[PDB]
Write an enzyme that holds these catalytic residues in place. Structure first.
Site, PDB file in Angstrom:
ATOM      1  N   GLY A  10       0.802  -1.206   0.000  1.00 39.48           N
ATOM      2  CA  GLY A  10       0.000   0.000   0.000  1.00 39.48           C
ATOM      3  C   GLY A  10       0.840   1.263   0.000  1.00 39.48           C
ATOM      4  N   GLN A  11       0.143   2.396  -0.090  1.00 44.29           N
ATOM      5  CA  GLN A  11       0.824   3.685  -0.156  1.00 44.29           C
ATOM      6  C   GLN A  11       1.705   3.905   1.068  1.00 44.29           C
ATOM      7  OE1 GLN A  11      -1.268   7.273  -1.574  1.00 44.29           O
ATOM      8  NE2 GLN A  11      -0.776   8.205   0.404  1.00 44.29           N
ATOM      9  N   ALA A  12       1.112   3.838   2.261  1.00 41.89           N
ATOM     10  CA  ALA A  12       1.873   4.081   3.483  1.00 41.89           C
ATOM     11  C   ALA A  12       3.087   3.164   3.570  1.00 41.89           C
ATOM     12  CB  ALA A  12       0.976   3.893   4.703  1.00 41.89           C
ATOM     13  N   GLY A 143      -5.922   1.874   5.157  1.00 44.21           N
ATOM     14  CA  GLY A 143      -6.047   1.681   3.728  1.00 44.21           C
ATOM     15  C   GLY A 143      -6.692   0.353   3.377  1.00 44.21           C
ATOM     16  N   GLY A 144      -7.288   0.311   2.184  1.00 42.86           N
ATOM     17  CA  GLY A 144      -7.917  -0.918   1.728  1.00 42.86           C
ATOM     18  C   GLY A 144      -6.904  -1.980   1.345  1.00 42.86           C
ATOM     19  N   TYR A 224       3.379  13.850   4.763  1.00 45.60           N
ATOM     20  CA  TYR A 224       3.845  12.468   4.797  1.00 45.60           C
ATOM     21  C   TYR A 224       5.363  12.394   4.729  1.00 45.60           C
ATOM     22  CZ  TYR A 224      -0.912  10.606   4.184  1.00 45.60           C
ATOM     23  OH  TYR A 224      -2.236  10.266   4.350  1.00 45.60           O
ATOM     24  N   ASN A 228       7.342  10.441   7.514  1.00 46.96           N
ATOM     25  CA  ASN A 228       8.054   9.220   7.152  1.00 46.96           C
ATOM     26  C   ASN A 228       9.538   9.305   7.477  1.00 46.96           C
ATOM     27  OD1 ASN A 228       5.615   8.282   6.232  1.00 46.96           O
ATOM     28  ND2 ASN A 228       6.071   8.602   4.059  1.00 46.96           N
ATOM     29  N   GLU A 254      14.928 -13.212  18.267  1.00 47.20           N
ATOM     30  CA  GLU A 254      15.209 -12.535  19.529  1.00 47.20           C
ATOM     31  C   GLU A 254      14.167 -11.469  19.837  1.00 47.20           C
ATOM     32  OE1 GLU A 254      19.008 -11.177  20.632  1.00 47.20           O
ATOM     33  OE2 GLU A 254      20.101 -12.944  19.927  1.00 47.20           O
TER      34      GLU A 254
HETATM   35  N1  GTP Z   1       2.733   7.862   8.170  1.00 47.79           N
HETATM   36  C1  GTP Z   1       2.202   7.726   6.962  1.00 47.79           C
HETATM   37  N2  GTP Z   1       0.875   7.383   6.842  1.00 47.79           N
HETATM   38  C2  GTP Z   1       0.322   7.239   5.616  1.00 47.79           C
HETATM   39  C3  GTP Z   1       1.077   7.436   4.469  1.00 47.79           C
HETATM   40  N3  GTP Z   1       0.269   7.233   3.404  1.00 47.79           N
HETATM   41  C4  GTP Z   1      -0.967   6.908   3.853  1.00 47.79           C
HETATM   42  N4  GTP Z   1      -0.949   6.921   5.224  1.00 47.79           N
HETATM   43  C5  GTP Z   1      -2.071   6.614   6.128  1.00 47.79           C
HETATM   44  O1  GTP Z   1      -2.647   5.384   5.730  1.00 47.79           O
HETATM   45  C6  GTP Z   1      -4.060   5.451   5.764  1.00 47.79           C
HETATM   46  C7  GTP Z   1      -4.622   5.245   4.360  1.00 47.79           C
HETATM   47  O2  GTP Z   1      -4.171   4.023   3.817  1.00 47.79           O
HETATM   48  P1  GTP Z   1      -3.257   3.961   2.498  1.00 47.79           P
HETATM   49  O3  GTP Z   1      -1.951   3.250   2.759  1.00 47.79           O
HETATM   50  O4  GTP Z   1      -3.020   5.350   1.963  1.00 47.79           O
HETATM   51  O5  GTP Z   1      -4.189   3.146   1.464  1.00 47.79           O
HETATM   52  P2  GTP Z   1      -3.638   1.918   0.581  1.00 47.79           P
HETATM   53  O6  GTP Z   1      -2.764   0.980   1.380  1.00 47.79           O
HETATM   54  O7  GTP Z   1      -2.910   2.452  -0.633  1.00 47.79           O
HETATM   55  O8  GTP Z   1      -4.946   1.105   0.125  1.00 47.79           O
HETATM   56  P3  GTP Z   1      -6.013   1.674  -0.945  1.00 47.79           P
HETATM   57  O9  GTP Z   1      -7.310   1.930  -0.219  1.00 47.79           O
HETATM   58  O10 GTP Z   1      -6.211   0.616  -2.002  1.00 47.79           O
HETATM   59  O11 GTP Z   1      -5.511   2.943  -1.595  1.00 47.79           O
HETATM   60  C8  GTP Z   1      -4.416   6.814   6.317  1.00 47.79           C
HETATM   61  O12 GTP Z   1      -4.655   6.697   7.697  1.00 47.79           O
HETATM   62  C9  GTP Z   1      -3.184   7.648   6.050  1.00 47.79           C
HETATM   63  O13 GTP Z   1      -3.037   8.687   6.989  1.00 47.79           O
HETATM   64  C10 GTP Z   1       2.417   7.782   4.582  1.00 47.79           C
HETATM   65  O14 GTP Z   1       3.104   7.961   3.577  1.00 47.79           O
HETATM   66  N5  GTP Z   1       2.975   7.926   5.836  1.00 47.79           N
HETATM   67 MG    MG Z   2      -3.686   3.423  -2.226  1.00 47.91          MG
END
Ligand code: GTP
Ligand code: MG
Ligand code: ACP
Ligand code: GDP
Ligand code: CA
Ligand code: CA
Ligand code: CA
Ligand code: MG
Ligand code: MG
Lengths: 437, 425, 315, 62
Positions: A10-12, A143-144, A224, A228, A254
Site C-alpha cells: 500500500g501507499q503508506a 487503507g484498503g 507524509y 516518514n 530474539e
Molecule cells: N505515516 C504515513 N501514513 C500514511 C502514508 N500514506 C498513507 N498513510 C495513512 O494510511 C491510511 C490510508 O491508507 P493507504 O496506505 O493510503 O491506502 P492503501 O494501502 O494504498 O490502500 P487503498 O485503499 O487501495 O488505496 C491513512 O490513515 C493515512 O493517513 C504515509 O506515507 N505515511
Molecule cells: Mg492506495
C-alpha cells in the site's frame, strides 16, 4: 549470516519503505546506484549488512525488498526516483485499480487476483537466501490495500514459510491525516486476521508522529514526507541490530523472545529521543540520562498512552552514538526512583540494553538535526491497549447502525466477519487487562 | 481509476453540461479548439480524467451529448467551446419528449437509447481504467428525466462494477416550465435511489433564492442559475481533476460519503457567491461555505444532521488555518453531526483557484435535511395525483396509474429512511 | 464558548458545577456520548481515560485523576503508606490488610487493645470476633470529646487539586459530630447517615463548622483551630498528594485532570490529628455548596478555559 | 542492581541490567474462503441483472 526480506504494501508501506531504504543506504554508505565502495567482497559476502542487501556481479547492493500496491501511482515514483537503480522491476508490483479504502476489496476481490504473483516474486528473493530469517511487513491499518491485502499475504506466508518469523510495522489511523471514514473498520478487520500470523508488531500512531513533528520540529502542517523521515529513524533504530555487528536482537527470533512473552500481546511500545529541529541554530546536546528519561515521557512515544497505569512485560533500550554502559546504569538508577515503572510479578524488573557507536544518520536537507547520541526504547506495556479501546469504540459506534457495512458485503464479505473480528478484539482487550491489573 | 465518461441529456443537461466544460477547460488551460495554452503542469497531470488526447496533441472532452430534439444541441455546437466536442458524440432525435417522462423513458427515448449506448461503449473501450460515468440532466422535463434514467439503468446493466454519478436539477414552481414537473421528478427520484452512487441535488428553488436574495438579481435567467451550477460543478470535481489524497476518485468518494446505499443524495454548497475585489479570509470561507444561504439545495441544514461532509478549499492559503477553522465548525456545532460516524468531515486543499477568485470553498454534505426537498416534491405530486390530474399525458404512452403509486410510495419511504437516522443516537 | 458533558447524574457537587457553567452563557452541555467536549464530569467507575486527549483542536479536561484510587481505597491507602518511603508514619493509625496478606503480622501486634475492621463495621476488643477484603485498624480509644455532650466527632476537609497540581484547601470545614455521649464500653460512628437514623441537639444536623469549633477551642482549651489541628491537617494533605504526584500528574499528558477530595481526620485528647480515609467522590455541606462549587469553576475550570476561599499548600 | 551478559565489539556493546527478580489454516481452507466470497459476489450481481432484466420486460410491455 541470515537474510531478511522486507515487504511494503500500500501507499503508506511503500512511501515509508522508500524513506527507510534511503536511510539504510546512507548509514551503510551505499550510493543511489547501489554501489558501495566500503564493500571489499565484490559480488557476495555474509556481512551483517547482507541481511538486508544482496550483491550482484557488478558490485550493486540490491535491497531484499518487495513493493506491492494495487494501484501504480505511488510505486511509479520509486521506478523514477533517486534510487531507481537500487531496485529491479521484479521487486515492484502494481495493479491498475486500488481497494478504495475497502478492506474486503483489498482482501477478497482484488487481492485474490494478485496474491499468487506477489508470492511468486517473494519466492524469487527467498531463493537467493542461504538462511532466511523471515519478513518485515510495512503497511497501514486504514487503507484498503494496507489492511486487506496484507492480511491475505500474511495468511499465505504462514503456509509457504511456516517456520519463518514475521514482524509488522503498522500505521495506526489518525483523523488529522486520515483519508477515509471507515478506517476503524479496516483496522479491526486486518488486526483480527493477521494476529495469529504476526510474531511482533510495532504500531505507529500518525497522531503521535504528527504532534512530534509540530512540537519538536516546528512544522505547522506536517506532510507524509515529514512523518516518514521520522518514522524511518525509529524503524532504523529497531533494525540496526539486524544490519550491524552486535549481540542484542541479532535475528528476528530474539525480538519475540526479548519483547513478546505472550504471543497475542505482541505490540511493543516504541519511544524515541531526542527529536531536534535542524532549523534550530544550536542545541545543547542532551546527556545519556536526559534522553533515557525522555523515553518515559508520553510526548515522545509512537502511541499516546500512559504506561504509568499499566504494567511492563519487557523493556529494551537501543542507543546510537556516544554512549557507554556506565552512563546507562546511572540513568536507570535515577529513573527507577522517580518514574512509576511497574512490572508484572512473573517478569524480572530489568532492561536489555544495546549500544551502537555510530550516531544516528540524518537525511541531508531534512528536518532532524544531527545528534551525538540517541535512544529508542522498546517496552511491552499493557498501556498500549488504550489504542485498541479508542479503535474499538469508534468501531462500535458505526457498526451499531451498520454504517458503510454494505460496501464490504458488496465485495463478498459477510456481516458475521465484522462481529467475529470485534469479538477477537474484545478478547484482546481482556487479555491486556488481566495482565495489567 | 482515471477515466470518467460524461453524459448530458435534455435541454437543462446540455446547457449546464456545456457551461461545465467551459469552466474546467479554462482551469485546465484548454482553448475552444482543444489546444493547451496553460502555464502549470498541475493542469495536465490529471487531464485524462475528463479529456482524451487527440492526434495533434489536442484534448477532446470525453463527453456525450444527448437530446430528443436538436434545438439545444445546435446551440451548443454554435457555442464558444462547441467545436471542442467530438462531432460523432452528438446523438439526437427529432420528435422531442414534450416534458413527458414517459416519452423519454418508454417511447421516444427507447427509439434513441441504443444509439447513445454505442457511443458510450466506444468511449469506454479506449479507457485504461474507467472510473464510471457522470450525468447532467434535469428531473422535471422529459428527455433528461425520462431518457436520462433509462440510460442510467442500461449503463448499469452493461457496466455494473462502475460508479454512477449524476448532477440532477430539481424542479421548483419558482422556476417552472410545466405543471407535470412533480410527476417527472418523482418518477426519476425512484430511479436515482436504485441506480446511482452519488447524486448532487441542485435545486432550482435554491438557485433562484440565491440569485434574488443574495446576488440581488431582479429577474434571474437560466443563465444566472447556470453560473451557480457551473461554479459548484467545478468545485465538487476539483478533487477528481487535480492531484490530491482525499476523495480523488469516484469510488473513494462514495465510500466516504455514502453510509447507506439509498441515502446518496448530496447538498452542494459554494463560497463566495458571485454573479468582488476583496478576497475572503479562511474563517469567512468556512462560515459562508456552511451557511444555508450558500446551499444549492433548498433545505435548512439545522433541520437535520450531517451523516458525512466533504469540503474543498481552493487557492493559496494557510493549510493550518484551514484545519483550525474546520475543527472550529464541528466543535462549535457538534449536534448537527451524527456522533455514530466519527470524523465524518474530510477536507481537501487545491492550490489552483477558480477563475476570477483567489479563494474559494466548495461544500458537499450528506444531510438528513435533504428530506425537505423530497417532501416538497411529494406534496406537489400528491396534490395532483389525488385527482389523477394530467395523467392522460402518461397513460397515452402506455403507463399505468400503478407505476405512479409505486413511485410515490418509494419516495415517501426514502423520506422515512432519512428521518430514521435524524433521530438515531 | 466551551463544551462539557455529564456522565455522573448522582454527583451533587458537580450537578451544581454544571449548573454554574451553563449560567455563564459561555458553556454548552453536549450529549453524554458526544466526543467533542472540552470538559468531562466523568463517572466514578471505569472512566475511559484512554479516550481523552485524542480530539484535534480540543483542549480536554476531566474532573478525576487517573490513579487516585490508590489513595481513596481502604486497602490501597494502607499499602501505599507502608510501602512508600516518603510516608513510612505518626499521623496514620496502625492498620493491616486482611482477606476473608498480613494476618500473622496483625496478630503479632495484638500481643489498650481495641481495634476496628472496615472496607457494615465491627469494633471489638478480642481479635477472634473480628476475623470471624477488609482492613483492621487501631481504634482511637481516647478521642477528643466536645462539651457539653462528651461526644465524638470527625473533621471533613475538602481539597482541590488542579491541572498544575496546585493543592488548594477549602477554608470551610465541617465537624460531623455524634449527638450521643461517648461510652468506652451510635456514639462511636460519626457518619451523617448513622446519626440521622438525640439528633440535632447541640448543633444543626450534627454539623459544627469551623467558626464555632474554633471558638470552643479558645474558650475550653485556650488554643486556636489553626495551631492545634489545622497545621497537622495541611501537613497530612500535602504528604499524601505529593507522594502520588509522580504517578497521577498530568503535567506532560495529552489530557488534563483535576479532582476534589474529601479528607476525614480524627483528633485525640492530646490534640493530635490522625488520618482516617480519603474520599475520591465526596459530597459537600449544604450551606457550603455555593461557595465551594464556585471555587471549583474559578480554580479548576476557568483556569484552563477562561471566560480567595482556598489555602494554597505550597510544595 | 546487577549487570550481566556484557558483549563487546567494535560496533558497540550490549548487556542486561536487572533490578529485581520475578515473584494455522491451510492453503485449501484459504482458497475456500476466497472463492466463497467470490460466489456471493456473482450471486448478488446475478440478482441485479435479473432485476434489471425484469425492468427491460416492463419497458416492452409499456
Ligand atoms: N505515516 C504515513 N501514513 C500514511 C502514508 N500514506 C498513507 N498513510 C495513512 O494510511 C491510511 C490510508 O491508507 P493507504 O496506505 O493510503 O491506502 P492503501 O494501502 O494504498 O490502500 P487503498 O485503499 O487501495 O488505496 C491513512 O490513515 C493515512 O493517513 C504515509 O506515507 N505515511
Ligand atoms: Mg492506495
Ligand atoms: N481508627 C478509628 N478510630 C476511631 N474512630 C474511627 C476509626 N475508624 C473509623 N472511625 C469512625 O467510623 C466512622 C466511619 O469510618 P469510615 O470513614 O472508614 O466509613 P465511611 O467511608 O463509610 C464514612 P465517609 O465516606 O463519609 O468517610 C468515622 O467517622 C469514625 O468516627
Ligand atoms: N438550472 C436550469 N434548469 C433548467 C434549464 N432548462 C430547464 N431547466 C429545468 O428543467 C426542467 C425542464 O426540463 P428540460 O431539461 O427543459 O426538459 P428536457 O429537455 O426534456 O430534458 C424545469 O424544471 C426547468 O426549471 C437550465 O438551463 N438551467
Ligand atoms: Ca560484499
Ligand atoms: Ca418514431
Ligand atoms: Ca446496437
Ligand atoms: Mg424544456
Ligand atoms: Mg468513604
Amino acid at each position: 549470516m541470515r537474510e531478511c526480506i522486507s515487504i511494503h504494501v500500500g501507499q503508506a508501506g511503500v512511501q515509508i519503505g522508500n524513506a527507510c531504504w534511503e536511510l539504510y543506504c546512507l548509514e551503510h554508505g551505499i550510493q543511489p546506484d547501489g554501489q558501495m565502495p566500503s564493500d571489499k567482497t565484490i559480488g557476495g559476502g555474509d556481512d551483517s549488512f547482507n541481511t538486508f542487501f544482496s550483491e550482484t556481479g557488478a558490485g550493486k547492493h540490491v535491497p531484499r525488498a518487495v513493493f506491492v500496491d494495487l494501484e501504480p501511482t505511488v510505486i511509479d515514483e520509486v521506478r523514477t526516483g533517486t534510487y531507481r537503480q537500487l531496485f529491479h522491476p521484479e521487486q515492484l508490483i502494481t495493479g491498475k485499480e486500488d481497494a478504495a479504502n475497502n478492506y474486503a476489496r483489498g482482501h477478497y476481490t482484488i487481492g485474490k487476483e494478485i496474491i499468487d504473483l506477489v508470492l511468486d516474486r517473494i519466492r524469487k528473493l527467498a531463493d537467493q537466501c542461504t538462511g532466511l530469517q523471515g519478513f518485515l511487513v510495512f503497511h497501514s491499518f486504514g487503507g484498503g490495500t494496507g489492511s486487506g491485502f496484507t492480511s491475505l499475504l500474511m495468511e499465505r506466508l504462514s503456509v509457504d514459510y511456516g517456520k519463518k518469523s514475521k514482524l509488522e510495522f503498522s500505521i495506526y489511523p489518525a483523523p488529522q491525516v486520515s483519508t477515509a471514514v471507515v478506517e476503524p473498520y479496516n483496522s479491526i478487520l486486518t488486526t483480527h486476521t493477521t494476529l495469529e500470523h504476526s510474531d511482533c508488531a510495532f504500531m505507529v500512531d500518525n497522531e503521535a508522529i504528527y504532534d512530534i513533528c509540530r512540537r519538536n520540529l516546528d512544522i505547522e502542517r506536517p506532510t507524509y514526507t515529514n512523518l516518514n523521515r521520522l518514522i524511518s529513524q525509529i524503524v532504523s533504530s529497531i533494525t540496526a541490530s539486524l544490519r550491524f555487528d552486535g549481540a542484542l536482537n541479532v535475528d528476528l527470533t530474539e525480538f519475540q523472545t526479548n519483547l513478546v512473552p505472550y504471543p497475542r500481546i505482541h505490540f511493543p511500545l516504541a519511544t524515541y529521543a531526542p527529536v531536534i529541529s535542524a532549523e534550530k541554530a544550536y542545541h545543547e546536546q542532551l546527556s545519556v540520562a536526559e534522553i533515557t528519561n525522555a523515553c518515559f515521557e508520553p510526548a515522545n512515544q509512537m502511541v499516546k498512552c500512559d504506561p504509568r497505569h499499566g504494567k511492563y512485560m519487557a523493556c529494551c533500550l537501543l542507543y546510537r552514538g556516544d554512549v557507554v554502559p556506565k552512563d546507562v546504569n546511572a540513568a536507570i538508577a535515577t529513573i527507577k526512583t522517580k518514574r512509576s515503572i511497574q512490572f508484572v510479578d512473573w517478569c524480572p524488573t530489568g532492561f536489555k540494553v544495546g549500544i551502537n557507536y555510530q550516531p544516528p544518520t540524518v537525511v541531508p536537507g531534512g528536518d532532524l538535526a544531527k545528534v551525538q547520541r540517541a535512544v529508542c526504547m522498546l517496552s511491552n506495556t499493557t498501556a498500549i491497549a488504550e489504542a485498541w479501546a479508542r479503535l474499538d469504540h469508534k468501531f462500535d459506534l458505526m457498526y451499531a447502525k451498520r454504517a458503510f457495512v454494505h460496501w464490504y458485503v458488496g465485495e463478498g464479505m459477510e456481516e458475521g466477519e465484522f462481529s467475529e473480528a470485534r469479538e477477537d478484539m474484545a478478547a484482546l482487550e481482556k487479555d491486556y487487562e488481566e495482565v495489567g491489573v | 481509476m482515471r477515466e470518467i465518461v460524461h453524459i448530458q441529456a435534455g435541454q437543462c443537461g446540455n446547457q449546464i453540461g456545456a457551461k461545465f466544460w467551459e469552466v474546467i477547460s479554462d482551469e485546465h488551460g484548454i482553448d475552444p479548439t482543444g489546444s493547451y495554452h496553460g502555464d502549470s503542469d498541475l493542469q495536465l497531470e490529471r487531464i485524462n480524467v475528463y479529456y482524451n488526447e487527440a492526434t495533434g496533441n489536442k484534448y477532446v472532452p470525453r463527453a456525450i451529448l444527448v437530446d430528443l430534439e436538436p434545438g439545444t444541441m445546435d446551440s451548443v455546437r454554435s457555442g464558444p467551446f462547441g467545436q471542442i466536442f467530438r462531432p460523432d458524440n452528438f446523438v439526437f432525435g427529432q420528435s422531442g419528449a414534450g416534458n413527458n417522462w414517459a416519452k423519454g423513458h418508454y417511447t421516444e427515448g427507447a427509439e434513441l437509447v441504443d444509439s447513445v449506448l454505442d457511443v458510450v461503449r466506444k468511449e469506454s473501450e479506449s479507457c485504461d481504467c474507467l472510473q464510471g460515468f457522470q450525468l447532467t440532466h434535469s428531473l422535471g422535463g422529459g428527455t433528461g428525466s425520462g431518457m436520462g434514467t433509462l440510460l442510467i439503468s442500461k449503463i448499469r446493466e452493461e457496466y455494473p462494477d462502475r460508479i454512477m454519478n449524476t448532477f440532477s436539477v430539481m424542479p421548483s414552481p419558482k422556476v417552472s416550465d410545466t405543471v407535470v414537473e412533480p410527476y417527472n421528478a418523482t418518477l426519476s427520484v425512484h430511479q436515482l435511489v436504485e441506480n446511482t452512487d452519488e447524486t448532487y441535488c441542485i435545486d432550482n428553488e435554491a438557485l433562484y433564492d440565491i440569485c434574488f436574495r443574495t446576488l440581488k438579481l431582479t429577474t434571474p435567467t437560466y443563465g444566472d442559475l447556470n453560473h451557480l451550477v457551473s461554479a459548484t460543478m467545478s468545485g465538487v470535481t476539483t478533487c477528481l481533476r487535480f492531484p490530491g489524497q482525499l476523495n480523488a476518485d469516484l469510488r473513494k468518494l462514495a465510500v466516504n460519503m455514502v453510509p447507506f446505499p439509498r441515502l446518496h443524495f448530496f447538498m452542494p454548497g459554494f463560497a463566495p457567491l458571485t454573479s468582488q475585489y476583496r478576497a475572503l479570509t479562511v474563517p469567512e470561507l468556512t462560515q459562508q461555505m456552511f451557511d444555508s444561504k450558500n446551499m444549492m439545495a433548498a433545505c435548512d441544514p439545522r433541520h437535520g444532521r450531517y451523516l458525512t461532509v466533504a469540503a474543498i478549499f481552493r487557492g493559496r492559503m494557510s493549510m493550518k488555518e484551514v484545519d483550525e477553522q474546520m475543527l472550529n465548525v464541528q466543535n462549535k456545532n457538534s449536534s448537527y453531526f451524527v456522533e455514530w460516524i466519527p470524523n465524518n468531515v474530510k477536507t481537501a486543499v487545491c492550490d489552483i483557484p477558480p477563475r476570477g477568485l483567489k479563494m474559494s470553498a466548495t461544500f458537499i454534505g450528506n444531510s438528513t435535511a435533504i428530506q425537505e426537498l423530497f417532501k416538497r416534491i411529494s406534496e406537489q405530486f400528491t396534490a395532483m395525483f389525488r385527482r389523477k390530474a394530467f395523467l392522460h399525458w402518461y397513460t397515452g404512452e402506455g403507463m399505468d396509474e400503478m407505476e405512479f403509486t409505486e413511485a410515490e410510495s418509494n419516495m415517501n419511504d426514502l423520506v422515512s429512511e432519512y428521518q430514521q437516522y435524524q433521530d438515531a443516537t | 464558548m466551551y463544551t462539557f458533558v455529564v456522565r455522573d447524574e448522582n454527583s451533587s457537587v458537580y450537578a451544581e458545577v454544571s449548573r454554574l457553567l451553563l449560567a455563564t452563557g459561555q458553556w454548552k452541555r453536549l450529549r453524554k456520548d458526544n466526543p467533542r467536549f472540552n470538559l468531562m464530569l466523568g463517572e466514578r467507575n471505569r472512566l475511559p481515560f484512554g479516550r481523552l486527549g485524542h480530539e484535534p483542536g480540543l483542549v480536554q479536561l476531566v474532573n478525576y485523576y487517573r490513579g487516585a484510587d490508590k489513595l481513596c481505597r481502604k486497602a490501597s491507602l494502607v499499602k501505599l503508606i507502608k510501602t512508600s518511603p516518603e510516608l513510612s508514619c505518626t499521623w496514620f493509625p496502625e492498620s493491616y490488610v486482611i482477606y476473608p496478606d498480613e494476618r500473622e503480622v496483625f496478630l503479632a501486634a495484638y500481643n489498650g487493645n481495641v481495634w476496628i475492621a472496615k472496607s457494615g463495621i465491627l469494633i471489638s476488643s478480642e481479635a477472634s470476633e473480628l476475623l470471624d477484603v477488609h482492613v483492621i485498624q487501631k481504634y482511637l480509644e481516647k478521642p477528643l470529646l466536645l462539651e457539653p455532650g462528651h461526644r465524638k466527632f470527625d473533621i471533613r476537609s475538602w481539597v482541590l487539586v488542579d491541572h498544575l497540581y496546585n493543592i488548594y484547601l477549602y477554608r470551610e470545614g465541617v465537624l460531623r459530630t455524634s449527638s450521643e455521649p461517648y461510652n468506652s464500653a451510635t456514639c462511636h460512628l460519626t457518619n451523617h447517615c448513622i446519626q440521622k437514623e438525640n439528633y440535632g441537639r447541640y448543633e444543626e444536623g450534627n454539623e459544627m463548622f469551623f467558626e464555632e469549633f474554633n471558638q470552643y477551642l479558645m474558650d475550653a482549651l485556650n488554643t486556636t483551630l489553626e495551631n492545634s489541628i489545622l497545621l497537622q491537617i495541611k501537613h497530612i494533605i500535602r504528604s499524601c498528594l505529593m507522594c502520588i504526584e509522580p504517578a497521577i500528574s498530568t503535567k506532560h499528558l495529552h489530557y488534563q485532570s483535576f479532582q476534589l477530595f474529601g479528607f476525614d481526620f480524627m483528633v485525640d485528647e492530646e490534640l493530635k490529628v490522625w488520618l482516617i480515609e480519603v474520599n475520591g467522590a465526596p459530597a459537600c455541606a449544604q450551606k457550603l455548596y455555593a461557595e465551594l462549587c464556585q471555587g471549583i469553576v474559578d480554580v479548576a475550570i476557568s483556569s484552563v478555559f477562561p471566560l480567595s476561599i482556598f489555602i494554597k499548600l505550597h510544595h | 542492581m546487577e549487570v550481566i551478559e556484557l558483549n563487546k565489539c567494535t560496533s558497540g556493546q550490549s548487556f542486561e541490567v536487572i533490578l529485581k527478580p520475578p515473584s494455522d489454516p491451510s492453503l485449501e481452507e484459504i482458497q475456500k474462503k476466497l472463492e466463497a466470497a467470490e460466489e456471493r459476489r456473482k450471486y448478488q450481481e446475478a440478482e441485479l441483472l435479473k432485476h434489471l432484466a425484469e425492468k427491460r420486460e416492463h419497458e416492452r410491455e409499456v
